[PDB]
Paper text:
The human type 1 insulin-like growth factor receptor ([name]-1R) is a disulfide-linked homodimeric member of the receptor tyrosine kinase family (Ullrich et al., 1986, Lemmon and Schlessinger, 2010) that signals into Ras/ERK or PI3K/Akt pathways in response to activation by the insulin-like growth factors I and II ([name]-I and [name]-II) (Adams et al., 2000, Denley et al., 2005, Riedemann and Macaulay, 2006, Laviola et al., 2007, Tao et al., 2007). [name]-1R signaling is involved in normal human growth and development (Denley et al., 2005) and in maintenance of neuroplasticity (Dyer et al., 2016). Despite these advances, there is currently no three-dimensional (3D) structure of [name]-II bound to [name]-1R or to IR-A. To begin to address this shortcoming, we present here single-particle cryo-EM structures of [name]-II bound to the intact ectodomain of [name]-1R.
The quality of the map corresponding to the open-leg structure is lower than that of the closed-leg structure, permitting only rigid-body positioning of domains into the map followed by limited real-space refinement. Secondary-structure elements within the density for the domains FnIII-3 and FnIII-3′ were not readily discerned, leading to preclusion of these domains from the open-leg atomic model. Surprisingly, neither of the two FnIII-2 leg modules appear to make contact with the ligand-free (L1′-CR′) + αCT module in the open-leg structure. No interpretable density is apparent for domains IDα and IDα′ apart from the αCT segment of IDα. Nevertheless, the existence of the open-leg conformation for the [name]-II-bound ectodomain is unanticipated, as such a “wide” open-leg conformation has not been detected previously in the cryo-EM studies of insulin-bound holo-IR, insulin-bound zipper IR ectodomain, or [name]-I-bound holoIGF-1R.
Residue numbers in the entry:
A (entry chain A): 577 to 633, 682 to 704, 744 to 799
B (entry chain B): 1 to 37, 41 to 154, 162 to 300, 577 to 633, 744 to 799
Write the structure that this text describes.
């Protein structure tokens, strides 16, 4: 049976420029199928709550497990508030995002699909946080 | 109802309704392959002898939904020495089994419950004995489950001390040292000593939820009355009851048999039925017809006192005998009563040495009553008299106090 890809591996990100971000990741541990594409999402995160207001100035277990397998072998299993910007990934586990708010924090979500995500759905996200370079 | 002689529940929760009238289950419970298309509650169930097994029960979020009052599992027989197994319970988030007061025999194994929280929020040492045998793997990562207890109560959980909870709304309920080894009712009212787990009234063997030893006619009892005999390991039945018991249908199927005061499906090995397959077993006399190195320290050296000025002591053969065991040589030393302590007003010791003949047991005499003693036992193989004797296996024990 086909399945949901693994989450992306080794999700890693940086900013090389103010208002710009670079992100790199690695292909999923188990594609379980041809990858189709990755989808990366990002959203402005608010700067942390409060903060603003305050003035800061021997073993045998395999024969055990077989017991659970033996009951299974009696039955088959047979498959038939700020806005997000978003972009799909065509190829690389790398993409670049621009016109970001300088020095703001963003969430980045990365999902890894496969050829069956049009039917199975795409994988859950592997995700990381990074900050853009401030507006020099 | 005494349900039985064995329960196998699979596929559908609509089949789970068999429990509506059950309160005791004779024999194991298996729960397999259930998938749902609801809440369920079975507070009538209170004690299971033997073990409970659940496997791939989709659609249950917490165990306190089904079996809140399930108070004792005896584990008289074990699944590979396990009395409870929970496997691949996708979606189970907590153990709200908050009346669970004892698991008598058996270890616990807990695998693949990837959403289970309240993992180590339960003091297993309160409810069951050799917790060191448990196996808890692949469940929701506690570092990321981030369990929580209200407040309730806490204990020295391994290297920690931490609050103990079944679920956010229910803790692992416990009894004070006024009951201690003995059970209690909710309000810390001590149960009857023949009782087990929670009680509907304190100190009454006729008001028990369960019995530690045996049950009969609404009475918790230590052993079967003379015309009553041990059955399974929890209740007594009369000579005629087992006389009604044809064993399980089998090529070797016969009536149950009574022996050593237990009524059992068949005689223990080395014993046979009297005469024409009689109700009682009898033993068969004979087979029934168809270089050195330094020894380890001794093992399991243990000792106690039954009298002032005396001690009794027992041990086990060493981990590595490294030879034929010859004998044991026992030493003992006075410890001081603990340092500091003495100075506040709250209102050089000799070794003895002696050499054992044969037993892992010996007696020591003329001690000061209530003084603490170190016993050092050195274990010397036939070449230890050249090699040097073993390091010690050791214990500290106290003489019974002088009144």
């Amino acid at each position: 049976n086909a399945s949901v890809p693994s989450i992306p591996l080794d999700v890693l990100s940086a900013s090389n420029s103010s208002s710009q971000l670079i992100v790199k990741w690695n292909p999923p541990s188990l594609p379980n199928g041809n990858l189709s594409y990755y989808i990366v999402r990002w959203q402005r995160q608010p700067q942390d709550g409060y903060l603003y207001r305050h003035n800061y100035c021997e073993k045998e277990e395999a024969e055990y497990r077989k017991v659970f397998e033996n009951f299974l072998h009696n039955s088959i299993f047979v498959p038939r508030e700020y806005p997000f910007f978003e972009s799909r990934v065509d190829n690389k586990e790398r993409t670049v995002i621009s016109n970001l708010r300088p020095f703001t924090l963003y969430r980045i979500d990365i999902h890894s699909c496969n050829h069956e995500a049009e039917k199975l759905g795409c994988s859950a996200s592997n995700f990381v946080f990074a900050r853009t370079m401030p507006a020099e």
